[PDB]
Amino acid sequence: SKDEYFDGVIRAGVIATTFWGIVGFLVAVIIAFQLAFPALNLEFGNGMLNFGRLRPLHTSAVIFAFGGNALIASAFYVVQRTSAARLFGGTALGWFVFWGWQLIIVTAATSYLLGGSQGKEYAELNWHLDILVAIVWVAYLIAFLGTIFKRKEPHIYVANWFYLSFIVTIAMLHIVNNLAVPVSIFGTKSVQLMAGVQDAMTQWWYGHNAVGFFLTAGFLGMMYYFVPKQAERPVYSYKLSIVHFWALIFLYIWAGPHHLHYTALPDWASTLGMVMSVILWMPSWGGMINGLMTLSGAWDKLRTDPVIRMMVVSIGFYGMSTFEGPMMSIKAVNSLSHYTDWTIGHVHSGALGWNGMITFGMLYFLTPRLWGRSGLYSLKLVSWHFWLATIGIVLYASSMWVSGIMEGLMWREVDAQGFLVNGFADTVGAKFPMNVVRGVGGVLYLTGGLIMAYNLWATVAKQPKTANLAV
Amino acid sequence: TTGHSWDGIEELNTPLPRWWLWTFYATIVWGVAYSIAMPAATPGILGSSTRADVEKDIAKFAEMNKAVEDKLVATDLTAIAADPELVTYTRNAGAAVFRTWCAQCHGAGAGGNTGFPSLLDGDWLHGGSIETIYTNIKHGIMPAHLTDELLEPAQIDDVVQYVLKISGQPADEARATAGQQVFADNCVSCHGEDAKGMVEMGAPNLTDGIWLYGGDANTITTTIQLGRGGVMPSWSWAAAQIRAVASYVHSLGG
Amino acid sequence: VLEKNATLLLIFAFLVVTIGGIVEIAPLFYLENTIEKVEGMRPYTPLELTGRDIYIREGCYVCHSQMIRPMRDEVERYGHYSLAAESMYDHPFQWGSKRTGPDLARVGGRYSDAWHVEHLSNPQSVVPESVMPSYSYLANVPLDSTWIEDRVSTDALVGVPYSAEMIAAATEMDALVAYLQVLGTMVDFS
Ligand code: HEC
Ligand code: HEC
Ligand code: HEC
Ligand code: HEC
Ligand code: HEC
Ligand SMILES: [Cu+2]
């Protein structure tokens, strides 16, 4: 039997997705405030709040915990339905992935503030945690790929192409970037296998591809399932799906050196990164086109359905960032952009605008269904959430652009006499209003997250036994 | 539309958008062009281009502003402070250079703080002359009496009180007699008697007015106990600029 | 097609995804420029190595870059543009990604130890406008150096030239200052 879809894990992951979203974004707001007012840092005593330590916590919680859980819930729901079979690992393998993932985030929460970090971005957790994550991910791929193997229909939905790719590539990236000799039990009590330029390359190959697969590909899978899930029928382009998918999947791995522009990294590598990052523009947009064009005719729905609003706007930000990224990947542009708040602007445009928004919409869609509910408790709240999230994202982006341009310019600016026009401190001071506005925008987005939490909770209350009949 | 449905979802067989195609192809073409043009070429750079552009940037900058610096170098530091052409451009830019390099220790104002000298004022530890200031800048930059058996716990207190009297007048009679005696013995050698101080040593004058230095009895006790040990890092490696800066610092007082 | 075939799709994906990594990462292992240390350079001294770990633990990297780009203005501000050879020993590499604070690569003497202590103790005190967090605990905690030998041994395994003699021979604030003082020094003296 077991004809019914295993909703179990998806339910757990969805709720946790909301929870981690709140935790991660709140850390985001707090650290932002710390940039605005350093007092928020403990003056005497490292303690609980210190920016250097908290920052990676924000990073990991937001990406792996929030984004990660979103990916788990979405992939488990989506693959099951798209292929029409009950999850291959079942409660056992899949639930293991749930608890295991939960353990991973919990360990991050304890470990990071404690000070144990490799110092490698998006890599920060210590080796023991790395082994745990590798194990959980291995289990996750078996469940997912197994689900595909067990499918009913002969064809495999493109959404699964993206999810599947994301799964495999992240595993490879994680293993490779994490090679390190353990000196001690924890924290970064390991030293990376590589050093210098090589370490930088491995790091950014890993680092970009992280957003590339974890944040883009996997999420593209989400978009592929959820955007078309609507009352309106067909409008899409399958051939684009094919071109866009392969081209993206191939091209994206080359993008690593754009991080490294005008650094110690050899010129040839930097160039390869730039060129491929520019080629990357097309496939990435292919995703957005495929998503948006699908809406055509359907647009009237946008006023009606806020979940749709979220998905659509999500693609808008996605395209924007996928455009801005290639531009910043040009050496001349990077010359200005690098080390400035602009990089952050770019990150949150994609993070809040693309990743968060699509996952949000995804959840609003799925959680009622998984919960054995016709719909969310209040649509109005989804709308309010939509607005809060949108203004917050835009405010964040605007502030960062102003700050970033100001910083790059101020840093580079030379006088008539040839001397440096501004002290670094002057640039720092210039940045303050930007820091505050950013703090506010992020705060608003966070509030939207709270509204989501309230709404979801209300809906969650309704029924025990929410097997949703056959499905 | 295509024949197979994936739970609700069906997909149209549609063509790639022409513009999308064009942009994709264009990017590819640009990439090939870039690679041929970059490392694998472009004209303008002999050999092969690289980060080598750095040399060009510096070189053109040098051509453009070499004259200003070169003119200044011939001139003496004192002259480079006076003259608003070099001399004034030396204060604003020297002042420009000052903010970037010096401000973090000596204050944006150049007024200084505890542990760092006030460059604006009249008082100079190493000497106010142009040569001295220049030397301070170019080549960069107090004995622990607590230990020297004789000084001890009490001797230090006494010397501190006495120095505060040289600087002004507090009231502690034991802390004065003893201190006078000790100062004449030891301190006076570097700080002189009546604390004129010796510029050669960088020993500051004890007969000073209220400055940023820890005038308090306790602070004086600590410096006497443990001694000083302050550094002015050399700008000869890091820094022409040193010269303009000397001209600026000199201009600062007057 | 290959739409239908799970194994084929998986294999092609793994293959497609691999090319960039093989093309970019692998050749670097081989290239000498990125491998060769500056001639003068030696590995971090045990105090400096410990301090570097502290710099890592604290999260200094999150605000401070250690990579000078080859532009005139940054050369002017920071010093000589960073060279691959400088980072040869760095497991893991410290190059920044963000400059909330200024670039640290070449503070090969720029400030006194005393300044560093005061500043780390309270950045606002020395630099009123600073965003930097206060790190007074550094003064509070002492180093046991139990682990230092293990750390150097591991680094040697990784290729760092520590002598047996170096291992045998080997406050947190002291270590951090020691680390900061070495940065970028290797190039200038050599
Ligand atoms: C922190 C590391 C400093 C740097 C950066 C700069 N200065 Fe400095 N300077 C510093 C100290 C602690 C002292 C006092 C040293 C002592 O005798 O205890 C000084 C001294 C000077 C002087 C001499 C002043 C005098 O009384 O003769 C000069 C002229 C001076 N400093 C200039 C100067 C310039 C131009 C700088 C930027 C290039 C600069 N200093 C940086 C501490 C520090
Ligand atoms: C020989 C060298 C001496 C000796 C024998 C004494 N002093 Fe000190 N002193 C000396 C120098 C070069 C400096 C400057 C230190 C620095 O700038 O880092 C000082 C400084 C002081 C100060 C501090 C002045 C200030 O607050 O800025 C004091 C209070 C002082 N010296 C006192 C002092 C006393 C009481 C001595 C006899 C016990 C004494 N000095 C001896 C150089 C030298
Ligand atoms: C984020 C906020 C940080 C944190 C995590 C660190 N620093 Fe910094 N730092 C920051 C700013 C905005 C500034 C400029 C204002 C100031 O000088 O206080 C700095 C400065 C430094 C400097 C001086 C650099 C220079 O002027 O050449 C150093 C040496 C420095 N910071 C060191 C340092 C260390 C060791 C850190 C981890 C404990 C650290 N910083 C963290 C902002 C931030
Ligand atoms: C991926 C999802 C994601 C979400 C959602 C997110 N962030 Fe971040 N955040 C990141 C990443 C990635 C970085 C690291 C950027 C870098 O290393 O350049 C970061 C870094 C930051 C920083 C450090 C900035 C700096 O200059 O060092 C702040 C502040 C911040 N985020 C605030 C926020 C706020 C406020 C929110 C409010 C919702 C938020 N974040 C939500 C991903 C996210
Ligand atoms: C989350 C959504 C997201 C999307 C979508 C995205 N990136 Fe980014 N981008 C990031 C993050 C996170 C960083 C910061 C990495 C770091 O910490 O240095 C970044 C930084 C960058 C930088 C600046 C690196 C530096 O330090 O100067 C470039 C260039 C870049 N990305 C290119 C791209 C390209 C090319 C694409 C797609 C074609 C893209 N981005 C899409 C998240 C994203
Ligand atoms: Cu990237």
Residue numbers in the entry:
A (entry chain n): 57 to 527
B (entry chain p): 13 to 52, 60 to 160, 174 to 271, 281 to 295
C (entry chain o): 9 to 178, 215 to 234
Lines from the paper:
CIII2 is a dimer with each monomer comprised of three subunits: the Rieske FeS (FeS) protein with a [2Fe-2S] cluster, cyt b with hemes bH and bL, and cyt c1 with heme c1 cofactors. The FeS protein external domain (FeS-ED) is mobile between the b (close to heme bL) and c (close to heme c1) positions. In R. capsulatus, both the diffusible cyt c2 and the membrane-anchored cyt cy carry electrons from CIII2 to CIV in respiration.
Cryo-EM analysis of the tripartite SC preparations (fraction B-1) showed that the initial three-dimensional (3D) classes were mainly of two different sizes (left). Focused classification and processing of the subclass containing ~62,000 particles with the highest initial resolution and best discernable features yielded a tripartite CIII2CIV map (SC-1A, EMD-22228) at 6.1 Å resolution (“Methods”), while another dataset produced a map (SC-1B, EMD-22230) at 7.2 Å resolution. The [2Fe-2S] clusters of the FeS proteins of CIII2 could be recognized closer to b (heme bL) than to c (heme c1) positions but had lower occupancy and resolution likely due to conformational heterogeneity. The two extreme locations of CIV with respect to CIII2 were displaced from each other by a translation of ~3 Å and a rotation of ~37° (SC-1A in red and SC-1B in blue). Other subclasses identified in 3D classifications showed CIV in various orientations between those seen in SC-1A and SC-1B maps. Comparison of the maps SC-2A (bipartite CIII2CIV) with SC-1A (tripartite CIII2CIV) showed that they were similar, with root-mean-square deviation of 1.6 Å.
